[model samples]
Target: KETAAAKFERQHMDSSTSAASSSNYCNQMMKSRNLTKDRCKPVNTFVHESLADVQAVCSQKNVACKNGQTNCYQSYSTMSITDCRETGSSKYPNCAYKTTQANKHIIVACEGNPYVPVAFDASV
Candidate 1:
C-alpha cells in the first residue's frame, strides 16, 4: 500500500496549478497577507520517484554534475539563488536543491481544496 507521503508526492508531481510560474499565486498569497514580494521567498521543491533519478535529472537539467542526494523542493526569493544545492551532506546525500530560479515553475492544474493553495503550516 502507498503511504501519505507517497500519495502526496504523486499528487504534487502530477499537479498542474502553477504556484511558481511568476508573481501569480504566491504573489496573491503574499499580498493577502500584506507581505512584500521582496521579503517573500518562494521555494520550489521537486519530488521524484527516486533520489538517484532526481539527481541525474537535476544534473542534466542544470547541466552540472551533482553528488548523489535526495529530497524535495528548491527555494528562491529575489536576486541570488538560495539552497540551490543537493540536500544532505556529501557523505549522506539527499537530492534536494534550493534555488531562486528553475527551468520552470511548478504548475498544479487541479481544482478544489486539495488543489487550492492552503497553508501546510503557519510557516509555509
Candidate 2:
C-alpha cells in the first residue's frame, strides 16, 4: 500500500517540468500518473518545484485543512503550479482537462514520522 507521503509525491510533485504551457498537459499527465484510473479527477494540482522545498512547507505557519483538520501548513513562498480541472464534457476512460498555471502559496497537510507533507489541501 502507498503511504500518505508517497501518495502526495505521486499526485502533486513535478520537479522535471517548471511550466505547463500546453493545454493538453493535464489531459496527458492526469492519465499517465494514474489519477484517471477509475474516473477522472475533477480537480488536481501539480507543483513545479523540488521535493525538498515542498516538504519544507510543513514547517511553515500552521493552517486549517479544508476538511477542518489542524495539521495543515502554508508555504512561505509562492510556488509554480499547474491546476488541472476536468472539462465539462469530459467522459470516463477518455478524461479531458484544462490546465492553468499560477503562482500561489500552497497549503498542505502533514503527518507521521519526520512530519512531511501528506496531502495538498489547497492554494492561497
Candidate 3:
C-alpha cells in the first residue's frame, strides 16, 4: 500500500512547474497522472514546491480540514500552485480542466505516526 505521504506527493506535488502557461496543462496532467481514470476530479491543486517544503506544512499553523477535521494545517508561506477545475461541459472519458496558477497558502490533512501530509484539503 502507498503511504499517506507518498500518495500526497504523487497527487499534488509538481516542483518543476513554476507556472502553467497554457490551459492544456491540467488537461494533460490530470490524464497522465491517472486522475481521470473513472471520472473527472472536480477540483485539484498541484503544488509547485519541493517535497520537503510541502511536508513541512504538517508543522505549520493548525487549521480545520474542509470536512471539519482538526488534523489539517495551513502553510505559513505562499506557494506556487496550479488549480485544475473540471469544465462544466466536460464528461466522463473526456475530462477537461481549466488551469489557473497562483501563489497561495495551501491547507492539507496530515496523519500517521510521522504526521506528514496525507490529503490536500484546500488552498487559501
Candidate 4:
C-alpha cells in the first residue's frame, strides 16, 4: 500500500472542523492529528479543499518541484489553507504553532497509476 497519499492527507488536508478556525486551530490540530504529539514535525499545512480537488492537481502537469522533479502540479484555483508553524521554543508533546490563513495555489507532487498527491511542496 502506498500509504504516502494517506499520510499526505492527514498531514496536509483539513476541510472540516472549521468552527474554531484560528490560531488555536493549529494548537488543536497539530496535537490532535498526532502530527506533533511527542515527536514534533515542526510545521504542517491544513488545506481547506476537497480531496478530489487536490487529487485533480495531479491531472494538471509540468510544474517542477523544489526537488527538481517534474511530477509536481500547481492548483488551477486558489485554495483556502492554514499554515501551522511551530514556534522556535515549541517543544514536543505540546507543540505551539502560529497560524496563517490565506487563499493561494497549492503545489503538490503526484505519482502515476492512480495519480494521487503524495507530497505538499508549497503554496502561492
Candidate 5:
C-alpha cells in the first residue's frame, strides 16, 4: 500500500518533470525552424575583385539581379542604375528572387566594392 504523503509528492514531481520536458521539446522545435539569426537585420558586405565575380556568385546562388542592375555611388548614398543605356552601366545589377517556400529569406551578395551577404526581404 502507498502512503498518501508519498503519493502526493510523486504526483507533483511527475507533473513538474512532464512540464519541463514539454517546454524543452517546444524550444528545440522552434530553434530548428529558425536556423538563421537576426532575420530582420541586413548583413553588410565588402567589395569583390571584379564584376564577373559578383555575377558568378549571384548566378550560382540563383539570385536575380533585377534588370542587370548594380549599385552606383551617386555622391554619398548608393543609387540603383535603372537604365543600361544611361550614363551609368552595370556589370552586375539588383538581384531579386522569390522562393517557393513561404517566409523564405533571400540572401544578397555583391561583387567588387562592398562584398558581403545582405538580406533584402522575406518572401512569402
Candidate 6:
C-alpha cells in the first residue's frame, strides 16, 4: 500500500532527525529505515529539507541524468544532505556506511503528474 513517493522518502528522506549526525548515524538509520536488511544499498543520499521543498525540484526544467535520462532537475535552493557510502569491505546482512554531511544544491529524478520525487541523482 505504499507509493513510490513513500518509498523514496522512507529510504532517502530524514528530515525528522539530525541530532544523530554522529559517525554512526548511517549505521543506525539504515537499520531502522529498512535500507539494510539482507543487502547493503552501497550508496544513498538523505535529504534534510522539507518534503515540499524537495518536491519543488520537479518544478524546474528537465536536466540530463547520468544515464542520459531527462527526468532530472536541479533544486531551486541549496540544502543540507548526507551521503551514506558503504565501505569497500562492507557486505550484505552486515551493511555499513561512512556518512558525510553537505550543504549543496540537489538534483533529483522525479516524474508523474503529481511530480513524485522518486530518487536522487546528485548534489552540488
lDDT of each: 0.28, 0.94, 0.90, 0.83, 0.25, 0.84
TM-score for all predictions? 0.21, 0.97, 0.94, 0.90, 0.19, 0.90
- Cα lDDT tens digits, model 1, 1-124, are 7544343343223133322444233333333433332343333333322323222222221111122222222212111111123324312111222333234322221123232221111111
Segments in model 4 whose C-alpha atoms lie over 4 Å from true places: 17-20
- lDDT of each residue in 72-112, candidate 6, tens digit only: 99876788888899988788888879989888888889978
- CA lDDT of 108 in candidate 2? 97
Candidate order by decreasing TM-score: 2, 3, 4, 6, 1, 5
Best by TM-score, which number?
2
lDDT of model number 6: 0.84
Per-residue error at 19 for model 5, in Å?
Answer: 24
Spell out the clash pairs found in candidate 6.
none
Taking the tens digit of each residue's C-alpha lDDT, what string does model 2 give over 1-124? 9988899999999999988979999998999889999999899999999999999999999999989899999999999999999988999988999999999999999998899999999998
Please, what are the lDDT tens digits per residue for candidate 4 over residues 29-79? 887787875587776888888889889888875599999889999998888
Better of 4 and 5 by TM-score: 4
Backbone clashes in model 4, listed as residue pairs: none
Please give, for residues 1-124, the per-residue lDDT of candidate 5 as tens digits. Answer: 7543332222111221112222233223222323113231112111212333322333334434443445311112121211001112212222121111111222342343334223221111
Task: Per model, state how many residue pairs clash.
Answer: 19, 0, 0, 0, 17, 0
Looking at model 3, report the run of 10 residues with the lowest lDDT sum. Answer: 2-11
The candidate with the higher TM-score, 2 or 6, is 2
Tell me how candidate 3 scores on lDDT: 0.90
Q: Which stretches of candidate 1 lie over 4 Å from their true place?
A: 1-19, 27-101, 104-124
Between 3 and 5, whose TM-score is larger? Answer: 3
Q: Highest lDDT: which candidate?
A: 2
> Cα lDDT of model 1 overall?
0.28
RMSD of 1: 14.8
